Amino acid sequence: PDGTVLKQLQPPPRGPRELEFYNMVYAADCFDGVLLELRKYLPKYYGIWSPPTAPNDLYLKLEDVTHKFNKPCIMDVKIGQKSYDPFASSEKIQQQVSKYPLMEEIGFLVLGMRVYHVHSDSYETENQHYGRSLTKETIKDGVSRFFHNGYCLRKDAVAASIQKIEKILQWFENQKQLNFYASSLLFVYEGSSGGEVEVRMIDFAHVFPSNTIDEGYVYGLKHLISVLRSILDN
């Protein structure tokens, strides 16, 4: 209710790595311009949290970016060509690539969506198997489904999403210090205007220091932008 969410740390090493990522980015004494700009695109972070009687039980206290919406329409999109990190074993690489073998080709994967429908006063939800079933031939209509609300295709929300993704893309083109694997973009628009539209980066259990542009992430964002752009011509 307070506008936040508690996300339980994933098992080690993933949860500890995500905690350290948030701790690094939101360090009070940080004056790295790259990290200060990155804050704009993340949920606000309120630190590690645990229940008063259970210090063993670890959570991240994060901004709930859907809180300002009346009927939020939400889509989660995993970004990049590789869902596995630079230290994955042969087995883990195979595990990750088999979850969605089109990741290299498309550069993104819809993890899920929840869409408000005006005429029925109800939500339609798609699970992980929806996005994993999409191919090059069906990715445009697949993404389009998210924006079908209010007796129309919400081209206002599509255009606003492109404009917000572009700012994230620009951040990625001006930093050579972090590479992001199996991270996502969370899209929110108002289902009940341009409008209230929010796009935030989430899921940081596989973010690593780097010396290069995150090329896979850039490829994914560019392709996602291209798909959304084609939807404006519907």
Curated annotation (Swiss-Prot):
Q: What's a single GO BP term from this record?
A: inositol phosphate biosynthetic process
- UniProt binding sites for substrate: R14, K78, K92, I93, Q94, Q95, Q96, V97, S98, K99, Q128, H206
GO MF annotation terms: 1-phosphatidylinositol-4,5-bisphosphate 3-kinase activity; ATP binding; flavonoid binding; inositol tetrakisphosphate kinase activity; inositol-1,3,4,5-tetrakisphosphate 6-kinase activity; inositol-1,3,4,6-tetrakisphosphate 5-kinase activity; inositol-1,4,5,6-tetrakisphosphate 3-kinase activity; inositol-1,4,5-trisphosphate 3-kinase activity
Q: What is the effect of changing Q128R?
A: Decreased activity with inositol 1,4,5-trisphosphate. Increased phosphorylation of inositol 1,3,4,5-tetrakisphosphate
Tell me the superkingdom of the source: Eukaryota
> What does the sequence similarity comment in the record state about its family?
Belongs to the inositol phosphokinase (IPK) family.
Q: What protein am I looking at?
A: Inositol polyphosphate multikinase
What organism does the UniProt record list as the source? Homo sapiens
Q: What stretch of the whole protein does this chain cover?
A: 69 to 416 of 416
